[PDB]
Amino acid sequence: GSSGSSGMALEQTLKKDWYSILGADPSANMSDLKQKYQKLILLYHPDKQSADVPAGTMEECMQKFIEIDQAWKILGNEETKKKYDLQRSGPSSG
The DSSP line for the chain is -----S-S--SSSS-S-HHHHTT--TT--HHHHHHHHHHTTSSS-STT--TT--HHHHHHHHHHHHHHHHHHHHHSSSSHHHHHHHHS--S---
Report the b/e string of 22-43 with b at 16+ CB within 10 A. Answer: bebeeeeeeeebbebbeebeee
Distance in angstroms (rounded) separating the CA atoms of residues 63 and 68: 9
CATH number where 4 lies = 1.10.287.110
User: Are the C-beta atoms of residues 59 and 65 closer than 8 Å to each other?
Assistant: no
Alpha carbon 43 to chain centroid distance?
16
> Among 39, 19, 17, 41, which Cα is nearest to 28's?
19
User: What total number of domains does the chain contain?
Assistant: 1
| Experimental technique for the deposited model | NMR
User: Are the C-beta atoms of residues 9 and 83 closer than 8 Å to each other?
Assistant: no
The one-letter amino acid at 81 = K
Its domain, for residue 85, covers 1-94
